[PDB]
Amino acid sequence: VDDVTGEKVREAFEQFLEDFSVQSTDTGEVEKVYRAQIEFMKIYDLNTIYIDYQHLSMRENGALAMAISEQYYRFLPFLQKGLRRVVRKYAPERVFQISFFNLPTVHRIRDIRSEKIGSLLSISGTVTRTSEVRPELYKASFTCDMCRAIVDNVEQSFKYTEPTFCPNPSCENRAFWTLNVTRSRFLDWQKVRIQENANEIPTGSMPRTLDVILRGDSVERAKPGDRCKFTGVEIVVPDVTQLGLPGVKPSSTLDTRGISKTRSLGVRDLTYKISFLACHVISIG
Amino acid sequence: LRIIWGTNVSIQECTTNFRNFLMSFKYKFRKILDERDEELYYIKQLNEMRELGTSNLNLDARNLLAYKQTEDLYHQLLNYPQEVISIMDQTIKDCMVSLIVDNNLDYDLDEIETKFYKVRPYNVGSCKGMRELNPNDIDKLINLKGLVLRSTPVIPDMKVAFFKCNVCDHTMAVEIDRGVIQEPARCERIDCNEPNSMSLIHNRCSFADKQVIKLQETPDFVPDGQTPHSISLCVYDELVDSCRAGDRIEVTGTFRSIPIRANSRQRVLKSLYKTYVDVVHVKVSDKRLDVDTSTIEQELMQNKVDHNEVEEVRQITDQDLAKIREVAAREDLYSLLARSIAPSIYELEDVKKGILLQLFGGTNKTFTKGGRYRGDINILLCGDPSTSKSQILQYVHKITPRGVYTSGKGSSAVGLTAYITRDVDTKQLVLESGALVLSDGGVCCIDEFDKMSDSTRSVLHEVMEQQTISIAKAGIITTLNARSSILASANPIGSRYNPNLPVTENIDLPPPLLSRFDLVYLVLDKVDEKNDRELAKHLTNLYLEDKPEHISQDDVLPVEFLTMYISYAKEHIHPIITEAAKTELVRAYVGMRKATTRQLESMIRLAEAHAKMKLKNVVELEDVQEAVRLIRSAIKDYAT
Amino acid sequence: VIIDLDDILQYQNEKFLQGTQADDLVSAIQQNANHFTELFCRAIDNNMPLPTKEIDYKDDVLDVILNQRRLRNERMLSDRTNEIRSENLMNDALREVVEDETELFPPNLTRRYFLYFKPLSQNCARRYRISSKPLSVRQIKGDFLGQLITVRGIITRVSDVKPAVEVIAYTCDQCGYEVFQEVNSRTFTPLSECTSEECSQNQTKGQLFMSTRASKFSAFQECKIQELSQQVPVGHIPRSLNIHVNGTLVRSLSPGDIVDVTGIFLPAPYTGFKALKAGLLTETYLEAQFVRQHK
Amino acid sequence: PGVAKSQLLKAICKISPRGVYTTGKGSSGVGLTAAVMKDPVTDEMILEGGALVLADNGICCIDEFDKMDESDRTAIH
Ligand SMILES: Nc1ncnc2c1ncn2[C@@H]1O[C@H](COP(=O)(O)OP(=O)(O)O)[C@@H](O)[C@H]1O
Ligand SMILES: Nc1ncnc2c1ncn2[C@@H]1O[C@H](COP(=O)(O)OP(=O)(O)O)[C@@H](O)[C@H]1O
What we know:
part of a larger assembly, 4 chains, B: alpha/beta, 5-stranded parallel sheet, 3-stranded antiparallel sheet, globular, C: alpha+beta, 9-stranded mixed sheet, 5 helices, binds adenosine-5'-diphosphate, DNA replication licensing factor MCM7 (chain D), DNA replication licensing factor MCM6 (chain A), hydrolase (chain B), DNA replication (chain B)
């Protein structure tokens, strides 16, 4: 059902971009639009897109708009899979990245909370300390020697481990590894650390930076010593360094009340720090 | 009679006990106040609550003490704060619903009742510091005070955890409640069985916000040998960011004790528990000390409305307003307030007065962009020693909300901004606000300004002009805003500055910096005979009473009235000089030129303070007269 | 509750004469002095005015927790004996049985008060009758460990008072009960699963987590003392010595003070770099029973 | 040079509790002001002072009061 409701949001969005995106008549820019975008991207075949938010917010009265904004991390997979669907339909090596822009609102970095977590948002600030571009897995072929490698999948969320199932064989496991660097897909990336805009900061609170990671062809778009405007893909990164913070800090101690006694305790603290992410980067300002 | 295991607080029957109170109170507080408003507070105020729907009924504590019943519940709240606060929350919710069913259809309709109502008790007890506290009180409501050094960014904290499966996959999630997240080993869908790894996806889980505010407390009443301690309080939820760095704050909250892992690898805990405050309630504004400006607050008005909140800007009743607008009529007002500022301090009225305008100083202007001349007016004063020149500093320091007080030579250009210290709690590098950055807004006070090292004062040529400071050093490179008045004390070389000699020479200083100060006071003793007798009559009093009373008496003086007055004047007035001024205004400047252009800037700012007072949106052609005379006042003192 | 060795001296000259011969407490006290705190303590715990009055409201917290612990402590016994007697089949015996089959809150967890000793100088030394010879920190050989000793020196440092935890309480929440672990030295490892007699031998052990209101904290403060600088031998340099402070005596000490500190002197395990120890060493410290300040 | 002025100060700082005897070169400027240093065991970075802070609520005593140079004189001033 949650699968079904989410999938419904899929079909609704896919219908959106396939349904008319443009009301402009006579002289134009007459319809469509986004088809023209898929095709203009098919011109140089660089496989990433730009689609505006405002339209999408207006069309459905926003039920879809809000459905995207609030649960957006939930709704990534359905969306890029939907784009893949339409591409498969009208178009003939698959890497896709979808980035909205032109949000209705701007939020200061100091105005960031955890209620907007996992949800797309807009943040503008002064970029600082860009960092050289390094590859990333997210698709890897890794298995043991026994009995065969070339299994390619998973490592989706940042972990980075490991193969999910159907080990070894026949040694079936558990186990772990081994990872190939000869077979996998990589993308990007460069990290940049963005600072609060000099003019804004509340007295005397003094500026506080946050960290924004750049994946996508959005790479290198950022510039050191410049004001920029980002759109959300917001998320979280875990942090070891918070101890003696003070607490009270939550933990992972597992519930073993199943099974029976005849692994140990297995406790891992979970302490996260907010760090923004970016699909879209503009130099506006 | 039930019970709670350790609390001796019987569930319910304290709810009855609390309700008879809540519904019926009025004022018994005045029996402690001794009397010398009629109807009860809480039903009215709780109504205001219900229409506004701000939630956050902050109670008082003590309204309870002294009233019967609840004579007991006060004790039970000071001792067992958390549980009791939960009870009270429930009670208030039920009291809401029961209040609605009287009026039938309310607020369309039944939703608002289910919304969470919570208490933020304050004003609890007179406590001694932090340091004084025993391990005997681990969890209790406790009061603190003192400026805020720094605040960390928001740290996210779990509320509802989230989980997915490798198989099938299924999405269910376990809520935290008590402080651990216990995940099921296996499994949902399949189930089965099967011992398949249960993934924890941390972007789908729900968080709340935990910030941490470092605090430098002043308990006063210092037992010695103690030196100022530092504290760390973790706020929560809505209270996040509701406190700027540098404020003087009254915060109340529950004392706390938690261990912190030593190894960071092993499970081991360090024993020797580390302690901190949980800060249930914050009490930013004060009656006794002056109120912050609006322009500076800005966003925290434009924000903090949306998620709502409580307190912040000091609020004024109606009839007292009706008293202010009456007092404004009084003709001797400009004189009157001047005597009221420093009650102990005798004569020297024009100093009191110039400073009086330092409190009202200027009018802020953004143009289209840039601009920003603020209201800032800056005052040096020099003279023979023992002239009270330091006392004023103390007093202004006491009134001005955000100001900071620095001695000469106890200062350095690094000390006045951007320390970039190691945090030592997290073993990280964190930025600290310097002394001028804190002092942003209100008034920085300076001792022995003449005596500053040569590298220092090189900070001020930045501030006085730009009104911001530009820090390109070390880690972070930015121009950050400090908008602040300066009141500087100076001792001439003499130290009696003596007749003749060039005075402009005899203040020392580079003359360019010296010309920059808005209004420069030179105080002198003409040995009036005929004075010292009068002055001795003033000071040699007290004497009586030993318990200080009737200081300047018999003299008509405002006390707490002048602060709400000054505040009111500042937020609700924005004077413009229009046409009338410019002629005389200019001819003054020329008359001085016949000095530097700054003196003009000075006049137009200083004067607009006068006009800011008296509640005039427009300057008179008059009132620029004394506004000059104040600059000429020192000249009648430059004759020798 | 402050104990004096002086009035003990007079107790013995009362029990000496006027016999029968009573074994000497004091010389047994200085020479060990650690054990006697705890033993003296249980000696006291038995005989007390029992009710002795109402606990009001406040009064205090941690007074009520105590009260309810003692109360549940009584009711358990009353219930067990009530039950056993019902079955059958002089009356001392059943009481004994009930007392030994039941789990109760140990005395040491419920006391509410502390015990300290003050050593004898003084007029009594010339009585004639050692426990106080004010000593330099040079004067302390490492052969005195365990004894009750009195030193005089300048306090320095003397860091902030904070809660230290002697025993920790956990609550199973499943089997109910409580779990009290005693805690020693610098660190401890928090226990998990369950030790509950009812969560023993079960298929599923319940999980427990601490409650900081239940546990027993002591006020802990550490302070260093340096040689009075007169007593230093001609060459060399003034030495330093550590001291611990628990319970009531806290906050009584301050820097720049010249003081006679009287405490039972005990070792705590440490050494330098691991490769620097022959073993086992002790690193020592001084414990503080009673403070007497010059000036 | 004589008249034994300082012996009165050893005297007083002996009699008065919370008295502290210091000299100029002597007690450094950092001697009177309080440094911030990491506190062992309990934490952290506690202000530890000397002279003036160390002795307060009681008499502080100074010798060679001329040779104290400048930064010190500002404190005492
Ligand atoms: N006009 C006055 N009214 C009240 N008190 C005064 C007046 N003049 C001097 N005093 C008293 O004399 C002292 C002045 O010391 P101060 O002026 O601070 O020294 P310095 O001038 O060296 O800074 C204060 O305690 C103040 O109360
Ligand atoms: N009236 C006096 N009674 C006793 N001793 C004195 C007297 N006058 C001077 N002295 C001696 O003179 C010496 C001066 O010592 P001191 O006070 O250290 O130096 P200063 O002479 O600079 O004050 C003292 O040691 C003291 O013994």
